[model samples]
Target chain A: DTAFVEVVLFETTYTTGLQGRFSRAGATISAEGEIVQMHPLGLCDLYEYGWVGVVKLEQPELDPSCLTVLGKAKRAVQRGATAVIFDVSENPDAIDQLNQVSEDPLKRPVVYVKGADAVKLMNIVNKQKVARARIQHR
Target chain B: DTAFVEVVLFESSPNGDYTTYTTGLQGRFSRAGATISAEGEIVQMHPLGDLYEYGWVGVVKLEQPELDPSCLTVLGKAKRAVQRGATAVIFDVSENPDAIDQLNQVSEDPLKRPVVYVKGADAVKLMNIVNKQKVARARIQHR
Candidate 1:
């Protein structure tokens, strides 16, 4: 059974949080870091390091390879991010698809939020606003 | 093998030849009219008009696309346009620049119309031309 978890995005003056779920076994469902955004270089090097990145569901490339959810998580790890969140656009079943991945090593604590919330988060980052996030899972 | 086809914007000029721009992506060849080379007047059906009456090609966006399907995907827009007698349909990327970069993926179903995607900036330029009472045309020339 999937249990409800709290994901909190903390700004200096306020906190925005949402309820999420995880289905991976033996997975650590807790992480905390500053939030960042992914750029065209596939590098997660933000203004400050050690931050979570908000990446789009479809990663852009010259040859244009279809991006899988696990693939995004792996890219986030390679770019030196603690966690990655997907900006799910119109694709609501993306989280379920990622949860279905059988490989443990490839799986990361990734979360997907609807496009509207992603926009809000991006605006926060674009303003050079500092925000921290915490994921608490049961 | 994936083929990279160039989708261009053609604006008609009274004194000069049509100005062209290299933009947009070509949908899978499996779709009808996907491989085409014809110039037809472009019209927007977002207001839900008699798009089929003009014999002109249709243009739509990702969301409205003139169709309110449960999922409003590009394939859905192309299908709707084909049903309404549109030779082709151009899916404009959302106004946001980032949204403009992601091309619509190939459709899982057999699409019946030639569908191309135009970048946001080019689409804006075309709209400006259209707003100036200038006639614009879209043609998919397979290379």
Candidate 2:
């Protein structure tokens, strides 16, 4: 895929209008996939289809420093996931610590969303079974 | 005693020239006597001011140019020194020696304390001097 796929969330609640920035230099993934919040391992739920993973800034159940925002993206790609979305944390001083993320076109693209925005998206996805979105980076 | 004096030191030795960058914020320098040195005893190179005791003056640097310094911005880190009871702060301006002439000029918040940014090479020298248990003293004289 040489062209960027603009992720436009079709009509519904939670960020009805927004654009996503990809990390890769020239990345592309055009598909309507279900957003799944991973649970450590066994993240390959639907077996072999394209899907997006919603993860946190740090993996509390695992090592934090070792498994950072970059680490999570690596994990999702290994799990056959198409893309990843990291939700910001409510930790008081955590926001100050976060900086500009590194770009990696070789792996799946990843984006970070604010905690408040993530909540809205979560509510829409939880209530609507047909909730789906498209993502791309060309 | 309202005369403001700015000191610029030019040296020739195994050492180098000394430069200072001040925060653009409004502050005061009462009869407070300012001093300089490399023996920053805060354990950590970049201190939060509150973590250790300081005299009327304090100095700091940008988080590791070769390592992880921390999350706070240059100004943010400098503020910590001010909060820790420093009447003034001296920061390491840059990491690369070649870029020493082009120091980080961004300054924010008067913080009611005087803050200055020192060139990287000079700062590195001071750190080495202080680390070696040597004394690098500075004083502020008013007319």
Candidate 3:
């Protein structure tokens, strides 16, 4: 089955569907968390439980140090985030490399999103600061 | 640059002057034969756990290219394939172009049989031969 995740931010209720690749590691995850935009750079602070870290890769040439789904999730997890959403651009060719980083499974789950829908997710996190997102992976 | 390996299949039928044309990329582990050819029966590259035996070439058309062939090392998909009597494997991506290339990053089995990739369109002809039990030859080489 595909990674068809339904994301609904409470309060304002900004909703969208994400059709993207999910990590075979910690792949099955569905819960709500406080949505927070993760810094693209590695220098990030830890968040409490119920925090959902969202990282975006706008460029395909991005380095894997803090860019790959696994790398971002590692950063988020180390920072105490429960789960993460890797907002990858619509470059299916890069998905293999994007997925290659997760050699070892992680406690935090990660799902990738592409196209304008991904950008929309980032916008929701940025514009609606206090809105916690209810993410359901189908 | 991408290795879009060209393949030409010669006719062994009533019309001796015919040719089938197609293009595909060769896997990194692909070794050049004295005369590269896929002259054998075709079958889907399915899991060997479910298959105690399979005869010849295994064609994998990746409709959903996510962690399918790469985890072969972890699951012994390729190792068990040899036990099932597989001669070679042909991979084709239904979506991404370089998806087959990603196989290089995975664990490489030196003992693994020859692996190659072709476009899904080219695989259509190969899959048709799956049920035929009829053999076809394609002089394969990537320059």
Candidate 4:
């Protein structure tokens, strides 16, 4: 059996904060058939936008390891999560970890993530919190 | 009596270090002079060739004070001594410190001294060492 996952990506803008504008752009989330997109990095000088991948994954029982964490993105989206925060914080072996997951034939396809600062902003957004930072990339 | 101190007047360039170049201009020292001209902030866009102050007080003796710092002009001049390679330096500040001491720290002068003695004779050597260690931004180091 397979389940459809929707991915949303976006970021916050200066109008949202009072400090000098920050340079971070957006975050990406993969969930059950619902994805949202936002942009926070468009500066007067250089405006960039969009995610590199959009896809669907097979339905699987919630993997015990997939809780708002490293390997649980598809489940988070299925549960109506606004965004999934990728943790690159302490685990240096995440690339290898991801490679291990991809080695499985039944595993949902993986989306490569990047731009740490922007994804951080997304985590706050999902948690329904405001940041005291300025959008700087302007 | 407050003696007004000014770097010798130069047709200043914008954003250049006028206060720096102005110090080199030679002028007559008077007991009570009104034209203390270092008031000119350095211009940024122009090249600073040379400078002179109207009433220049040669720091016959310069000793860094631990407390009163933020005196850029005095500190710049004193620090320059190490630049020229004077091993043992002395600046007579019993008098100059008077004019330097009274003014508020910010308004008085740039706080450059006081830190050096503890900052050490090694510190006096820092600007040079930092320069010799790599390319420098100021000519005094290169010189």
Candidate 5:
């Protein structure tokens, strides 16, 4: 089987807030796929156009921050992406991130997984299992 | 009533079409009792803001050269303007000695309405009028 595998970097981590400890993070491309092997609440979905994402600080938002996250995520969701991943290292504006992902009903299932925040954001998900779940299963 | 005015000079005869004589065109302005006027059958109107008209073309068509006696009459009419002190004279083509004479020596309407070649330089005079009118008309006017 020929797999058109494309490795992409979606989100990056940044420091913020008064002490810069309130780490807020987000993914760039929102895909739909299986949870694969990650912590609780991670995501994997179908991606038509690959994406780039960032995890930002929650204390004080950066000047040019978060604008592209939702847009790329939304586009990825629409194109029937196969997997979506979130960084557990930090919770980067979870509510806003959720809002962007939930705007479309026909969207692929989103896995909300967690990872280490004080480090890099490298996430992966399994596509085959996710492509078969029902609407309410993800 | 006395009318306020400005003066200009025409140093030469122009060349081009002068058809559809029009003037005294007006428009509704935003301010109360505010109005605009193009002196004659304003064939074209250009406003230079502040609710004012900057320029316009007043035109009257003349006969062609092939209309026999009427063509003679047309030629005569063009000549008549020179006699009446038409500062600038314009015709459909080149080599109008009669027009050239009046353009340099005459004074038109006491204001010297500039004559222009409708087909020459893509009507630079017309474009000038348009730009001036647009800029001048873009002012805030009252009454």
Candidate 6:
């Protein structure tokens, strides 16, 4: 029952109990838009309904990143993304640090899943441009 | 959080269906064995270990569906059922489906003797009636 919610992309779904520590606004979340590889990695422009964003961890084998997941998520919200997902399938276990949250809460959602799950979602986003997600927690 | 389940027992069957339920967003399906026909007596695997684990891990806890010396997962359960010439195996699931790793525990889909995980209430009724001595005849088929 960690604070993390659920992240559904395309046809696959998994809990976001491993997501970032940022603040959330609702118990249920739904968003639909084009899925894009946010470059400058969450430091760019994400239009309205900019629902889902994908951040590829530069070093799946390394410890952390220059831009923290929380940092990237905050930038994503500022840019207008409804929800964000990081494609860290390169090393899902290594990304466990995403669960460590200590900053002020934000309204948007941020999520990351295990390797196979991310790979599954990434593979689909690769084939299509438009997608939607439905997430909730009890 | 509480969960309630309803069970329908016909000793008989339904429409064309593999197996499926919808999460808010996606639908996952499991198909019957090759033929749309299957029937058998429900049997329980002893000790939770026999159903959820393997080898000494389970042996230490008490178990064996030795089809695989490695793991006694649903996949292994069905394989052993087939060797016994049984029709199919119905694996009992927990109240919260998500809590069980259905994705990883199962290795074969469409086994010679089809296998599926059903809500526990269905099995509960059969187990109670069987008296652990009688066979609970059941039939399952998919279109």
lDDT of each: 0.49, 0.41, 0.50, 0.26, 0.27, 0.41
Alpha-carbon shift of residue B109 in model 5 (angstroms): 99
> Over the stretch A56-129, how does candidate 4's per-residue lDDT look in tens digits?
21122322232322334443323222232332333334434444533332112233333453354345445542
Candidate that scores best on lDDT: 3
The DockQ value obtained for model 2 is 0.01
Docking class for model 2 is incorrect
* TM-score, candidate number 2: 0.33
Candidate 5 structure quality by residue, lDDT tens digits, A56-76: 322324323333444433443
Report lDDT (Cα) of residue A62, candidate 2.
Answer: 48
lDDT tens readout by residue for model 2, A44-77:
2332233566654443454334445555566555
What are the per-residue Cα lDDT tens digits for candidate 2 across B22-128? 11111223222222111111232443334443433454555444564566555555566656644355555565332222223333324543444545345565455
Candidate number achieving the greatest TM-score relative to the actual structure: 3
Q: Please, what are the lDDT tens digits per residue for candidate 4 over residues B1-143?
A: 22222222222234221111112112222122111111111111111112321111222333345653444444454444323322112233443544344222343333221111112232234323333332111111000
Ranking by lDDT: 3, 1, 2, 6, 5, 4
| Candidate 5 CAPRI assessment class | incorrect
User: Quick one: RMSD of model 4?
Assistant: 22.7
Model 1, which residues run further than 4 Å from truth?
A1-13, A23-28, A40-49, A58-67, A105-108, A115-119, B1-143
List, residue by residue over B1-143, the lDDT tens digit for candidate 5.
11111111112113211112111111112111112211111232211111221222222233233432343332344344434433222232222323333433433332323342222332344334444442111111111
Query: What DockQ results for candidate 4?
Result: 0.01
Residue B27 displacement (Å), model 3 = 50
lDDT of 3 by residue, B40-91 (tens): 2345565433342223555665545365545453224444554565544566
DockQ of 3: 0.01
Least accurate stretch of 10 residues (summed lDDT) in model 6 chain B?
A: B53-62
| Count of backbone collisions in candidate 5 | 60
